[PDB]
Amino acid sequence: FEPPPGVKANMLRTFSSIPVSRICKSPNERARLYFLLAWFHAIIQERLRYAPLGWSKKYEFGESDLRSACDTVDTWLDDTAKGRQNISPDKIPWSALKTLMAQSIYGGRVDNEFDQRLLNTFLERLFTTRSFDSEFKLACKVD
Amino acid sequence: ERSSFPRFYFVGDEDLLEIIGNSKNVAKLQKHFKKMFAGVSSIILNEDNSVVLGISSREGEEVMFKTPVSITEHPKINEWLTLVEKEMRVTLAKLLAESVTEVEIFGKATSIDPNTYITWIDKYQAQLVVLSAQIAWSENVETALSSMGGGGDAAPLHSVLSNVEVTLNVLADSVLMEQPPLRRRKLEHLITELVHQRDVTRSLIKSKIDNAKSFEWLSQMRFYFDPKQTDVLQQLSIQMANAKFNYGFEYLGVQDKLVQTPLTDRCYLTMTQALEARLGGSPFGPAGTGKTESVKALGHQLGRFVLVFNCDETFDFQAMGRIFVGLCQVGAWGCFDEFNRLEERMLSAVSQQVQCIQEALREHSITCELLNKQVKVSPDMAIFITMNPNLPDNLKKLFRSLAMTKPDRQLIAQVMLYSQGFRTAEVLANKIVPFFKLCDEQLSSQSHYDFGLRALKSVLVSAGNVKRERIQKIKREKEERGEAVDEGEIAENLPEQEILIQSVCETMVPKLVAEDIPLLFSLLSDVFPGVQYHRGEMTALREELKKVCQEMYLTYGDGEEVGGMWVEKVLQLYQITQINHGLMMVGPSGSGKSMAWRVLLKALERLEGVEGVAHIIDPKAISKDHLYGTLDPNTREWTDGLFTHVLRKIIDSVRGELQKRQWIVFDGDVDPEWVENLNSVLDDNKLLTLPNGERLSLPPNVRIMFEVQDLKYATLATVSRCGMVWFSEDVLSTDMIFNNFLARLRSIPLDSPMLQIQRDAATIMQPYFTSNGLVTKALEHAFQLEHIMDLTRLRCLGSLFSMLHQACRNVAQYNANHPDFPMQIEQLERYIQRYLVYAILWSLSGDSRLKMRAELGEYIRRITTVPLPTAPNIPIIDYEVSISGEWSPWQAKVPQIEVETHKVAAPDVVVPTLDTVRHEALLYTWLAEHKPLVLCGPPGSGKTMTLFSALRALPDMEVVGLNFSSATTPELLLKTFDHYCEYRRTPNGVVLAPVQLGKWLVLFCDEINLPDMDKYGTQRVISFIRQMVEHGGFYRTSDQTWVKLERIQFVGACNPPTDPGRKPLSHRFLRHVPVVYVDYPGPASLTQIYGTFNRAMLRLIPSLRTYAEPLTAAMVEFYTMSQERFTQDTQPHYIYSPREMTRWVRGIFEALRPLETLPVEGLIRIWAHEALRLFQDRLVEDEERRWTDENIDTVALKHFPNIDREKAMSRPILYSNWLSKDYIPVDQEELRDYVKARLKVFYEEELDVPLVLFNEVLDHVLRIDRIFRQPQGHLLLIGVSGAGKTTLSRFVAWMNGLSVYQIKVHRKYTGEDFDEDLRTVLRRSGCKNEKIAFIMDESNVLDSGFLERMNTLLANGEVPGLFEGDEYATLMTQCKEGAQKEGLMLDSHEELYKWFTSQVIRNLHVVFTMNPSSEGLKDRAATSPALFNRCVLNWFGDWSTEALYQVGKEFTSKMDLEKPNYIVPDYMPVVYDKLPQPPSHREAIVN
Amino acid sequence: PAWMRTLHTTASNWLHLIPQTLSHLKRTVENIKDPLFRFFEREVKMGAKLLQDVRQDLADVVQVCEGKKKQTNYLRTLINELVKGILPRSWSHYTVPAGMTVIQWVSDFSERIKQLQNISLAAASGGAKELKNIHVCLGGLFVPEAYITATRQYVAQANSWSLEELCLEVNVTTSQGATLDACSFGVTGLKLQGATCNNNKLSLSNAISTALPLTQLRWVKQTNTEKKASVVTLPVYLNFTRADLIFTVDFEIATKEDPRSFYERGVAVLCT
C-alpha cells in the first residue's frame, strides 16, 4: 500500500486524519490556519519525490511533524485568543508559527543550511497576514 | 525500601547494601553522595558526626544549611537523607533570593564598585551568581518592555544595555589581575553569561520590540523570580517560548559554562519545545559539535544534573538498567552519547526500555514497569539521545530531532577570549578558528593529532594564562624599576597576537612531527602575518641540562648542533610539565623518551633544590586488579593497588615526600581498560576514585607521565585529558648513540686495568664510529637488506655494543692469562679492528639468511679499509678473529668426534659443526653480559638443543624450560619464580634470587612469540619480560612493592614471525634482545654430522663398516632434492628438516640393532624403506611419488653402483616384525595371509565389518604399526572419509594391545567435557601403565582451544592445566600407587610428576584423522604447530583403481555374473591397469 | 568459466584505457613557500599512488585470469566486487557519487589522471608562476575545497593580507574573452542548474543545466558593505547527488526577478 501521489490527495489525507472538532474551534481563523498548514505540509512532502532538486536529501517529513505543527498552532492560537469568537488576522502570532516551524518542527531534520533557507522561504511566503486576503496566491504561474 | 526517598534509588545494589550496613558510619556514605548528587562530593558535619551542617563540592566550594539536619533525631537512613535534600533545596532558594536582592542593588546603576561586586561574587556560588545575573537581567528587560507598552515612547532599555556594558567592562578589568582559581571560574562564567545578555539585548534593540508579549522576546530564555510564592522551590520559574520549567534547585557545584551561540539557542528552543510537548529530543550530528554539552548546559541552567552514558561497544545493561530506573525515580535528566555505537541487541533492548518510559511520560501529561518493578517517573523526567550519522523505528515517533551540523567555533573563540581578558577578541577569534581549520586540513594526518573544538578551548585557556603571567612579570619588573603601576596601562601596551601565537607554539609544536613544523610556521605567517614568536630559552635550565647530560654520558646541544633537537624536546617536556599535571610522551622506540624525562628530573633537582623520586610502573605487566586495588567479594577487605599504594605513601608525607617532586612514569603501552580509572585523575579534579569509594587527593608535586611508543589504541578522552610531546625517531641520531656507547665504555668498567683496556679500545674504534663512518654506512646498508625479524636501529647497535664489551673482556682475559707479556698496542689495534668487523657482520646480519650475510660481507669488504681475508669465495663470517688479532677459519675450531653406538640420534648428543660452533660463540658472548636473546629459526634446525648444549656447557647457570602457549599469562612466570626462587629482605629492598646460591637461573621459553596478543596489540608475558629486563626488577602483586631481580636472566627461542600461528614481537621488546637466526644445517654440516652418526651406528656390524661414508653421502644427497622439490608452497605439510634426517638414522639403527650380520643389499633395502617411510608418505599426487621412487633409484645406484638392483630394491619394500622375531623384510603374500588371519580373529572378537585386503591396506597397516611401536607415537591420518583411516587405526591398536579411545562429541560437548575426557585418558595411561590409542577426528573438534590443549600435550607429553587442586592431589595419589606397584619409591611431587610424564610419553598414543583439505591443512598447521612439528602424517588419499577393482571382485563374489554367452569385443574400454587379457563377464562387470 | 573470460576481457580493456604513470612534482624551497605548489604536489602524490595501486590490482587480476596467480583474500574480494559491478572499497579513496558503477568510476579516474598529468607537465615546464595560471576543473580534483583554500592562501601571501579578511568573487566569462588578473584563478567544469549566466547575471530558465564556460575565482579585501538585494548565494555541490558542499558563490540576478524564486527552484552550481 502506497500513498497516492498528488497535492490534492495529500491534502485530502491530511484533512481526513485531523479530527473534525479540532479544526472547528472557537476562533474561526483556526480553520484557515489549518488549511495553510495542510497546504504547506503537502508542498513540503511532495518536493521529496524530486530528491536532488526539491531538497538535498530524502528527509523524513512524516505525519509526526504535522501533528506537532498542528499542536503548536492550537497552543499559540489559544494563548493569543483567550476564548474569543473572532481574532483579527494581524493579531495572529505569525512570527511564533514561522519560527517554531523553521527551528523546532520541520527544522530538526534539516541539516544543510540551504534546505533551511528554502524552508524559511516557504514559511515566510505562506504564513503571513497577507494570506488572509481573498487575493492570496498559494502558488504562482503554475501554467 | 527504595520506594520511599526515590533519590537514592539512583545507586545500585552494592551501594544500597553498603549504606544499609554502614548507616551509622556516615563518614562512609560520601561515596553514595558522590554518585547521586551533581557536584556534592561530601557533606559537611561537626566533630560529633551527628548533625549535617552543609554540603561541599569537589572543587571546595561549600554550602552551609540555614537549619542543619541532625541525624540523631532521624536515625533512619532515608528520613535524614530526605531531610538533607529538602534542606539543600531550601538553602539554595534562600541564597538565590539574597543574591537576587544584592544584584538588584547592583543593577540599575551607572557605575559599580569592583570591591563590593567581587565580594558579592565570593559570597555565593558560581551557580548562584549566574542565576542572580540572569534573573536581574530578565526582570530589567521585562520592566523596560512593559514601559515600552505605550509604543512610540522613549526607550530606557538603552539604559539596560548600558548597564550590561559597564558591568562587562568591570569584569574585563577584574580578570586581568591575579585571582583565586575558584573566583576565576566564577568570573569566567559570569562574563560568558553577560556577553550573551549583551548580544541578545542588542538584538532586541535592533528589532525595536515594544511589547513584552512579542515573540522575539518570548523566544529568549526568561527567568522569573517570585519571592511572594510560599514554596521556595517554585519561587524561580524558567520560561522560554511557550514552555515553562520550574527550577530544580539542585546543587550542581561548579560546571564548565557553555557559550550560547545561535546554534546553542536553537538547541535550547528545540529541546524545550520537545519537553513541553512531553517527548525527548535527539540532537543528531557528527562528533565534537556540542551534542552532549548542550544537553548538559540545558540541564544545569534548569538546575538538573545529567548522567551522560558512554555508549561504547563494551556497554553494561544491568548497571545501566539500575542507573536509568534511578534517573526515572529521581526525575533528573539522562543523556545517551553516541547511541548508534551499541550492539544491535543492546540497541533494541535499550530502545524498548526508553520507549516504555517515554510512553509512560506522555501518559503522565504514575508508574511504569521497569526491571520487573514499579517505578514512579517524575513529570520533570527527560531523555536525550545523541546520535552520529538513524533513530530506532520504535522511537522515531516519540523523539524530536535536531541537527548539530556545525558549532559556532568563531563565536565560541570570541567569547572565551573576551572572558580571559583579551582585548580585540573578535580579530583573534576570526584569526584562530580558520587557523585550526587549516591545521586540520592541510597538515598531514597523524594518529596523535587533534584539532577539534576541545583543542581550541585548551589553546585559548593556555593563552589566557600566558597573558596573565606576562602581566605579572611586567608588574614585578615595574615594581623593581620605578613604582608607577597601572594594570590598564600594562594591558593596553601588551601585544596580543604574539601571546596567542606563543600559546599555540607551546601547546601544538610539541605534538608535531619533524616535517609538519615548517608547514605550521607557514600557516601562522599566513593567518597572523608580520608577527612572530621566538621562545626565550631557559638559560638557567640549559646549564643544568648540560651538567646532567655530562654526568650521565649523554650528548647535549643547542639548536642546530648535534643533539639540539633532543634538548629542545626536553625543554618542551618541561613546559608541558609546568602547565599540566599528567603527561604522555609519544615516540617510536629509540627516541630518548626515558632519558629525556630522567635527565629533566635530575636537572630540576639540581636547579630548584627539590630532589625528585621516580616510580616507574608497568601497567600491562601487572594485573589491573592488583594495580588499582582489590576489594574482596565476601570479606569486603580493601588492599591498595600499587599505584594507589604509592599515591597513599606520597600523600602520607612520612619522610617529606610532599616537599619532593615525584614522577610516576607509566612506562608501557596504554589501552582503554585501566586508564579509564585514571581518567578521573588526569582531569582538573585530580583525584583517584577507587572501587571502594575512597579517594586520595593528588598532590601538586606528583606528575603522572605515560611514556608510550604509539597512540593507535588509546581513546580520544585520554588523549585530550593530558599533554603530549612527540619524540620523532630523528630526535637522537646515530651519532648520539655512538657517543653514549663510547663514553659509557670509557667511564664505567665492565666488571682499573680493564678500564684502561676499554679506553684504548674506544680510542681504536673512534675513527670507525664517527659520522658517515664504517658503522653508519653499514647500518644504512643493513637496513636495505631483509631480516627474519623487524629491524630496529637500537637492536643492532645494542648487539654491536654487547659484542664489543665481550671483545674487551676477551682482551682482559688474554692479559690476565699472559702476565709476562701484556698485549701490545699494535696487536690490540689489529684484534680490535678485526673483531669490530666480525661484530658488524654478526650483529647487523645476525638475523638473516646466508645470502644476505654474504651480500653484507661483500659490501663491507668494498667500503672498509681494514685488512680482510683473501679467501676467493669463503665469506668472512666463516672466519673468526683469533685472540692474536688474525683471521682464522672457523673450520679449524670444529673437531671430529666419534659418537657411541648406543647414543645415535639420542636427544642429548650434539655433534659440533660450523653453525654449532659459531652459535656457541654468540651465545657465550650474549650470556656473559646476561642480555636476553631470542633464537629465531625454522622448526627443527636444533634451536632448542643448541641452546641447551651451550647452557649445560656453562657450569654456573641453571636452566628452567617454560613451554609458552597461546594462552600464556605472566602467572606462569610467577609460579616458576616461587618454585625455584625465594624473596629475601635486604636494606636496598626485597630481592628475588634463586634458592640455590651462586646460580644464574635461566628461563628458557620454548616459543617466545607464541603467546597471543590482546585486542590492543599487547602480549602480557612479552610486556612482563620487557619490564624485568629493562627495569631490573618487577612488582610483587601480593604486597605491591618493588622486587629486584638478582641472578635471574631470560633466554628465548621462536619460529619465524612469518610462520602462521606466531605474532611479531613488539619493537620495544626487540630493542633489548638480540636475535640470532639458526638456519637449517648446510650440505657440509649434515654430511659431517650424519657421517658421525653412521660411523657410530655401523659399529654393530663390522663387515659393512666401510660403507658408512657412501651411505651418509647418499642420505644427504637424496634429502637435498627432497627438500628442493616439495617446497612448502605446493602443500603446507611439505616441510623438510634435519629432524627427518635424524629420524632416518634412528630408524636404520633400530632396524640394524637386533640383526647380527647383514650384506650391503640388506642395508640399501633398509635405507630405501626408511626413505619411503619418511619422504614419500607425505606426498599427495601420484606423479610426486613416482618422482620419489625414480630419484631414490638414481641415488642408490649413484652411491652404491656395485650392487644388484633386483634384490636390494625389489619393488614390494615391506618390513614387519609380526611373522619373524626381528624387523626383517616381509613378503607381501605371507604378510597378506597373516593379516587376513588376524582380521578373521578381529571379526570374531571385535566389530564384524568386512575389510578386503588390497596392498594399500597392507602398506598403511604396517606404517601405523611402526608408528605405534615407536615411543610417543602420534599420527596425523589424512584422507577422504571412508578410506579406512579409523578402521585401520583400530585394527592396529587391537593387534598391538592398545585400547582404542574416542570421545563421544555432541553439540553440547563443551571444552570442560573435553578436558574431563583428556584427564580420564591421562589417568588411564600413566597411572595404569596401559597404552592408549587416542582417536581424534576434526569432526570431534568444535573449537581451536581443543587444538591448543592437544598441541601442549603433543609438545610436552603432558598439560599442567588439566590437573590442579584436588584433581592434582588425586593424580599424585594414583601415580604414587603406580610407582609402588611397579617397584619405584618416590615421595616428592616433582619426581612422581616426571615419572607420570615418562609413563604418558611412553604409553599414550594420539592419532588425528582428517579430510584432505589443502586450505584446511594450512589452517590447522597455522593453529597448532605440534600436528606438523613432530607428528608423522600419512596420505591415505582415495582408493586407487586397483583397490576399486579388488573391492568390486571380492564384494560381488556371492552373485553369479558368469555368462558363457559373453563375447570379447574388438575394443575393450579398460580402466583397470592389471585387467586380464581375456576379460571374463565378472571381470568386465567389476571393470 | 565464461565469467572469468569476460572479466579478463574487461580488465584488459580497462588496463589499456587507464593511463600508465604519473610524475611527482620537484621539491624546491621557493616552491615549498608557494601554497598552490603544496596542494598540487599533495594531489599528484595521492593520484599517482592510487593509480599505481589500481594498475597493480588490475595486473594481478589479469595474472589470476591467466591462472599464473592464485586468489588471495584481497584479490578474491576485489574479483567479487568487479563481477557484481560494485565499486571496490580499496579503490574509492576520494568522494564518489553513491550510485556510480565501476565503469563510470574508471572513466572518471582516467579523466582525473589525465588532468593530473597535464598539471604535472605544466609545473615541470615552468614553475609556481605558471602553476597559478592553470585552468583546473573542480570536479576532477580529489579535494576541490582544498584547491579553494590553496588559492585563498596564495592571494593572502601575494598581497601580504591575512586570511580571515579575504572574500570570494566569481566572474563567469568565456574562455577566450577572459582576463587573468593577479588574484584570478581559472576553473572549468562548473555547470549551473536552473539558470543561465550571461554577463555574470543570472536568469531563471527552463533548461535543466547550463554549462559555465570559465569560472574565475578572485579574492578581494572585505568591503564591509551589505550585499545588494539582487545578490543570491548559490551552493556549489561536487556531484549531482548534492551531498558535498564545496563553497558558496554570489551572483547578481537580473531585473524583475525574485531571489526567493531562485531559492524555490533549487538553483545550484555543480562541479560535475
Ligand SMILES: Nc1ncnc2c1ncn2[C@@H]1O[C@H](COP(=O)(O)OP(=O)(O)OP(=O)(O)O)[C@@H](O)[C@H]1O
Ligand atoms: N641525549 C642522548 N645522547 C646520546 N644517547 C642518548 C641520549 N638520550 C638517550 N640516549 C641513548 O639512546 C637510547 C634511548 O634510551 P631510552 O630508554 O630513553 O629510549 P626510548 O626511545 O625512550 O625507549 P622506549 O621507547 O623503549 O622506552 C639509550 O641507549 C640511551 O642511552
Ligand SMILES: Nc1ncnc2c1ncn2[C@@H]1O[C@H](COP(=O)(O)OP(=O)(O)O)[C@@H](O)[C@H]1O
Ligand atoms: N557553545 C558550545 N557548543 C558546542 N560545543 C561547545 C560549546 N562550548 C564549549 N564547547 C566544547 O565542545 C566540546 C565537545 O563537545 P561534545 O559534547 O564532546 O560534542 P559531542 O556531543 O559531539 O561529543 C566540549 O569539550 C565543550 O567544552
Ligand SMILES: Nc1ncnc2c1ncn2[C@@H]1O[C@H](COP(=O)(O)OP(=O)(O)O)[C@@H](O)[C@H]1O
Ligand atoms: N647441528 C645439529 N646437531 C645435532 N642435531 C641436530 C642438528 N641440526 C638438526 N638437528 C636435529 O634437530 C632436532 C632438534 O630440533 P628441535 O630442538 O626440536 O627444534 P625446535 O625446538 O625449533 O622445534 C634434533 O632431533 C636433531 O637430531
Ligand SMILES: Nc1ncnc2c1ncn2[C@@H]1O[C@H](COP(=O)(O)OP(=O)(O)O)[C@@H](O)[C@H]1O
Ligand atoms: N580395506 C577395506 N575394505 C573394505 N572396506 C573398508 C576398508 N577400509 C575401510 N572400509 C570401510 O570403511 C568404513 C569405515 O570408514 P572409516 O575408516 O571410519 O572412515 P575414515 O577413514 O574417514 O575414518 C567401514 O564400514 C568399512 O566397511
